[PDB]
Ligand binder design. Structure first.
Ligand code: WCP
Ligand code: MN
Ligand code: MN
Lengths: 670, 670
RNA sequence: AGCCGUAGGGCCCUACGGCU
RNA sequence: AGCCGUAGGGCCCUACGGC
């Protein structure tokens, strides 16, 4: 895949390392084919500091780079054989391109150390605000990054090798804690030194993954991709009353406007939100093949269609009533929400699963009715214990139902944010004829792949690791629901076979609770009370801001009426004033001075259509004015009393509990 | 890839053959897993009538069907070893689904005939307008086509065995003329016989590819995909004055609204429209990596950006002025143009190429100044000969320039619609020093891969197929342009080496002209005059319709201004009437009666804002009316005389020729 | 192990006609 | 023989943390 240069003189020859063919093309078009060679990689390169030699040497990209440089690796390294005196790292001008840069430096430091020592390793500086080099025109890439007469390359420099080994060990190694400690210690919410570069690039990547990718916000329970999808459907009015909309139109729109990442990242996030076995309260309503519990993926996006579910309307309720802060998108062309109003506690209701850098999050879904009664209880007692909260919130409530073994794990997770929860399958022992029996499984644990579990059981039988099993079939149908049958050998104790299946297969699975979520844009391990407290404050803020909006909005309307009232009373003198005016400006000025009107009032009059001059309009204006004055009072009453505001939040949460609250699916066996 | 059923009694067992995994997933979810198995294929299967036996037996999808059926092929076929007593073909409910069915039937007929004889082969009947089965929910696919209670299956019956043998060789064989004749003769503009199925399904497909895919319309020179891309850019304001819009937004929009096919087909058609080496007059203006002359493809659609070129504004000019006919899109939720106004001769300016069924198209690009001059000469003389047109139209004009050898092939092509055009590269012989020489190539033939051409020269040198070549280099760059160097051995005759390169390499390429375009939605082999006659007809129609639309609209606006003028003249009376009326209906009824106004006139007065009563606004109304009366008079002139209409078409083509007309690139050599 | 879910990145089989 | 351009269809490597 190497697009080598014509020359054979390494001293004048250069090799550019790009992320793939999309960047490679632009680079191949702009380059000097005489002295500049191109090697397109394939995205994220292997982390050699975490991988063993067998994996390193059987890797396609690693192999290709060694063959391109001709020096060999490690012990057998020979700088004389170097085919290029310039190895230039030209990854994309984004957080993931910085990660691939740290990955390439890691491989040059552990396998090609004298290449850095000779100053042969350089870092290209393409301009920011592109998605990739593939977004650049050939001419723009030459002049800014490739022309030796105008480019600015950073030559990689190695100073203290003890400091370098420690940095590559800390940032790239297998020990997560030291990496987590570096993020905590450093995170703030032409030649280059290899240590400073690794630390800066890796920190940009880690901070980006943590605050803007893998972890959900504590207020709305969403990760950036999900929030962008829901905001996307909302903006294009893809509400439940409207028809389904083409998946590609949704994905295309969201990619261009809010999410500058791969289509598959966007589309798979939309798919999961539509899966009744993934989401306890699904956020997307899908039409077509959206996958199954057997690991089957969704159909290609050209076949599927989607829209919002009714509960999603509750997450987006009052978004245009200045309840949430808006921010600029990635390119400054659009505005996006920083958080959603979230009228129901979505973090805990739907849960979250995220693998970040230096940490991970594993939050289980819960029952909406239980959560809401918990929030209601907390609003009535700020000093409520986790034990009192557990009277309302019994434990997680998986979409796939099943069983949880005791309150011990649950209790530990709700008090510390960490705990192991044993999930069991719903399995019964029934007779099948002729004095024979069978095990019937109708509920499997959360996130357990049904077909994969069936194969692990078959494996255990074929490899003689389990006694008593004659046959196993999957009888699942849309009619019957999940139905896995395991036939027992006549006279064999089916209960013994079942307990052996719980201990040796995904029939019994564990859920490692690790409640990490963003609190004030920062990752934080929180407990059940902390999570509810942050959600309750978000509601109080959203409701306060909605009331403040309406009040400003109602006071502006009342002021417009005061003026329209004045216009209808002095209609003939108003018309006369406009008629005798040469321009709009003169008319504005004259109406203001004569009738004691403001700029807005005069503008409202000038905008008034002739049909507003009808008989039942002065009565209409006065009817609206009076009702508005009542409404202004209702709003001022809420803002004056914090207890009234708090009751308003409770009332609205109670409506949501009655409209959306369903029964518990998962049995917590004591 | 087989998703087998629980049962092992073939007599009750059914095997469903689907297009791929998107359809497969809906099928796996909706089925009865006990008696129904699924075999997801991978799109179009091999054509066993045109393929050599060795290719058939090593083909992955063919192997998978034989393995699944467990019968064996041809002579080693055993109906006793049949794993299912029902082989159900369930392709998508579209033209390509019909093709895959004809492809499947052919393999069953030539390799597993007793399977048809036993009445084991069936045809499922999924509901029409979905794109794929993956667009449907499992329960919908179960009830409509998979449930034995409600389904309507067609059992394939083989009646006449001589008729079937002859049918399969006609539709699926290598002899095109038999297939072309069948299309021509048959084109129109529960048991089932295998011959009737093959004929209907093949005609479905063949017809679709001919009128709705592979052939350009004679009027706008576009194929459905190109037309839908350009219309998509117009309906999204993706004009040259505006900024580049993301390719993914364009793709998703076009696919969802007008083109029900793969995104690779839409994106690749848009890409080609943006390449200056493919389009004589590029239709798309691309930002980023849009591919090269070396066969390099464009960047993934998430990286690229695009908009209309200035020339495309001329293809779409006045589309929203009732110039062309709109039709319903594929699903009856959108409107799409049937043809574009096409203010310049696009078919001949950009050319076309497309492989259809029973026929193909191959039209070369031409120079815009020459084409317009040709149309102008034709407008002044309906009886003009091809030889006289050839005074204006010298011949094709490739974007990649080069040379054409003689007028003989050109003359034949313009007179019959068919001819062989000999194209040559622009190659010179020059000195390089020390008595030695080289061949410099600076222009290569049209649609020739530069890199592949170099490798062809390289392999001739290596395998000693050519003599005298010491070196071969691509010295091309953005700066220099195309530059290929072939170093000659000292004292060797370079012109001899050159003539040899022209005989043995793509350095000399023929262009087989085959002018097949859609004339009245029917494919026709047309010559030069016919192509321009149909273009001119279309322009006369567009400009007339535009004038007729502009007259209706101006007459509707003068009418509304007549009403507002009456109101400005009797303002106090108008106000009185509105003020006295209790409702908007009573006001409208009174104004119509009191001032002899129409319903439209009265509504316009009621909609009038107070700001229209000022001096400047009062004058605007009068000036617009006076401007409009002159415009109506100018429009009526155009419609009174046909020579004035034709002069307008001529003056509009002269404007376009002066603005877009450029120099000829391809040299026509005697 | 290798899986979970957001991210980086690309490749190859088929049909169809007319030219070589 | 195999390329040209709209069409049908889908796979597999990489990072990252916890168990
Ligand atoms: O924003 C929008 C709007 O409109 C759209 C409609 C449809 C689509 C889906 N298109 C695709 C789907 C898979 C794809 C990558 C792919 O080609 C698939 N694939 C395989 O299935 C198997 C092997 C393989 N090996 C290399 C390779 F590059 C690819 C492979 C190619 C097209 O990447 C994106 N995307 C958009 N995006
Ligand atoms: Mn990138
Ligand atoms: Mn299909």
């Amino acid at each position: 895949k190497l697009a080598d240069c014509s020359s054979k003189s390494p001293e004048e020859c250069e090799i550019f390392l790009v992320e793939g063919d999309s960047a490679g093309g632009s680079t191949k078009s702009g380059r000097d084919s005489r002295t500049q060679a191109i090697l397109p990689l394939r995205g994220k390169i292997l982390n050699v500091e975490k991988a063993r030699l067998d994996r390193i040497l059987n890797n396609n990209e690693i192999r290709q780079m060694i063959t391109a440089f001709g020096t060999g690796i490690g012990g057998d390294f020979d700088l004389a054989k170097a085919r290029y005196h310039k190895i230039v790292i030209m990854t994309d001008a984004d957080v993931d391109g910085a990660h691939i840069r740290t990955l390439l430096l890691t491989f040059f430091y552990r396998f090609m150390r004298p290449l850095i020592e000779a100053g042969y390793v350089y870092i290209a500086q393409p301009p920011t605000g592109y998605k990739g080099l593939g977004e650049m025109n050939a001419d723009q890439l030459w002049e800014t990054t490739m022309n030796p007469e105008h480019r600015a390359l950073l030559q990689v420099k190695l100073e203290d090798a003890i400091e370098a080994d420690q940095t590559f060990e800390m940032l790239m190694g297998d020990v997560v804690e030291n990496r987590r400690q570096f993020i905590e210690d450093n995170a703030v919410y032409n030649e280059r030194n290899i240590t400073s570069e690794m630390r800066e690039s890796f920190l940009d990547y880690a901070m980006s993954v943590i605050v803007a990718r893998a972890l959900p916000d504590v207020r709305d329970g969403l990760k950036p991709v999900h929030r962008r999808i829901l905001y996307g459907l909302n903006e294009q009015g893809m509400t439940p009353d409207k028809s389904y909309k083409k998946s590609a139109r949704i994905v295309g729109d969201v990619m261009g406007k809010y999410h500058p990442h791969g289509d598959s990242s966007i589309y798979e996030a939309m798919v999961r939100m539509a899966q009744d076995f993934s989401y306890r309260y699904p956020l997307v309503d899908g039409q077509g093949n959206f996958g199954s519990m057997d690991g089957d993926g969704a159909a290609a996006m050209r076949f599927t269609e989607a829209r919002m579910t009714k509960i999603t309307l509750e997450l987006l309720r009052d978004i245009n009533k200045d309840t949430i802060d808006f921010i600029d998108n990635y390119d400054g062309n659009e505005r996006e929400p920083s958080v959603l109003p979230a009228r129901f506690p979505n973090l805990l209701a739907n849960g979250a699963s995220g693998i970040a850098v230096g940490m991970a999050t594993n939050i289980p879904p819960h029952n909406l009715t239980e959560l809401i009664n918990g929030v209601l209880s907390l609003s009535k007692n700020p000093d409520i214990s986790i034990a009192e909260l557990m009277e309302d919130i019994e434990g997680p409530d998986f979409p796939t139902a099943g069983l949880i073994l005791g309150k011990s794990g649950i209790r530990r997770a709700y008090e510390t944010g960490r705990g192991s929860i044993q999930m069991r399958s719903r399995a019964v022992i029934e007779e099948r004829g002729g004095g024979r029996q069978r095990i019937v499984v109708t509920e499997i644990p959360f996130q357990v792949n049904k077909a994969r579990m069936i194969e692990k059981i078959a494996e255990l039988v074929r490899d003689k690791k389990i006694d008593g099993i004659t046959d196993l079939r999957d009888e699942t149908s849309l009619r019957t629901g999940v139905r896995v049958v395991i036939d027992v050998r006549k006279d064999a104790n089916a209960s013994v076979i079942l307990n052996n299946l719980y201990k040796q297969t995904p029939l019994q699975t564990s859920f490692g609770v690790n409640m990490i979520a963003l609190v004030n844009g920062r990752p934080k391990l929180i407990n059940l009370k902390e999570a509810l407290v942050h959600y309750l404050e978000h509601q109080k803020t959203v409701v306060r801001r909605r009331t403040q909006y309406n009040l400003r909005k109602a006071k502006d309307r009342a002021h417009i009426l005061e003026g329209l009232r004045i216009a209808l009373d002095h209609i003939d003198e108003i018309i006369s004033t406009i008629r005798e005016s040469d321009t709009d400006k003169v008319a504005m000025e004259s109406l203001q001075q004569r009738f004691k009107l403001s700029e807005k009032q005069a503008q409202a009059i000038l905008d008034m259509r002739l049909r507003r001059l009808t008989g039942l309009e002065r009565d209409k204006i006065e009817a609206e004015y009076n009702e508005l004055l009542n409404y202004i009072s209702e709003l001022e009453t809420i803002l004056a009393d914090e207890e009234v505001l708090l009751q308003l939040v409770r009332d609205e949460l109670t409506e949501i509990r009655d409209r959306f609250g369903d029964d518990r699916r998962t049995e917590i066996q004591l």
